[PDB]
Structure 1
Amino acid sequence: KRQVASGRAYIHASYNNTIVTITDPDGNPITWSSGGVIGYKGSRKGTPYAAQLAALDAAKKAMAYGMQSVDVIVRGTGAGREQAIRALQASGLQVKSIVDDTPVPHNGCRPKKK
């Protein structure tokens, strides 16, 4: 919560939206944005431009929190995937290091009818 230096952004990319979060070097959400923190509704939220606006929004509020250096860990497969990071370049926030940790089971729970 407190004005701090380092940090970590979390890209959650779905398929009908995409969300993220600035979170202190501990793992606790400082700020966060989505496809709805952009205004766009429904499918628009599966959009890279919506994602740009998301990241911009997210990171933006971090810089108002003194944020500068942030790591990156992303999950999902949304059209705003890479875009949610590439917006985080022209964000002024040091992308200290980007990492992919998308959840993937050793195969266990039987999947929905798709």
Structure 2
Amino acid sequence: KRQVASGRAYIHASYNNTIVTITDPDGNPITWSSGGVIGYKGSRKGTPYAAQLAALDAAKKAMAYGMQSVDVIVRGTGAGREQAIRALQASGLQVKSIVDDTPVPHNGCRPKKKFRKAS
């Protein structure tokens, strides 16, 4: 128990899953949720629907902390990124801003063969 009421919401979305971390404005996590936090186990975690349920679960557990308004930060390309966004907008948390923080190297590190033909 905190009583924060305003915070950040991080949507980390890859092709295999979506995980959502609601935090206080200092960045420290309050609650988190994912495809697997809900019933889903296999590839189904990567589903947009899974992202919806995850976003909603994170938002619910967050509103238990008395959270009202959040700022959304998005990382990574994958399905259910925009679905997580939309679910957060429909969540009952006022969404202030949305931002794409997705990490990219400046030609830094050699990829796995699967990600190659690039660097």
So what's the TM-score if we normalise by structure 1?
Answer: 0.96
User: Using the alignment, how far apart are the partners of 1:25 and 1:42 within structure 2?
Assistant: 33
State the shift of 1:89 in Å: 1.1
User: Using the alignment, how far apart are the partners of 1:15 and 1:55 within structure 2?
Assistant: 16
2:39 maps to what in 1? 39
Gaps of 5+ in 1: none
Number of residues of Structure 1 aligned to a counterpart in Structure 2:
114
Identity score, percent: 100
CA deviations over 1:77-99 (Å, ceiling 9, x no partner)? 12111001100011010111110
CA deviations over 1:44-89 (Å, ceiling 9, x no partner)? 0010001100000000111111001100111011211100110001
1:62 maps to what in 2? 62
Gaps of 5+ in 2: 115-119
CA deviations over 1:11-41 (Å, ceiling 9, x no partner)? 0001111101000000011001000011111
User: Using the alignment, how far apart are the partners of 1:95 and 1:47 within structure 2?
Assistant: 23
Backbone CA RMSD of aligned residues: 0.9
1:83 maps to what in 2? 83
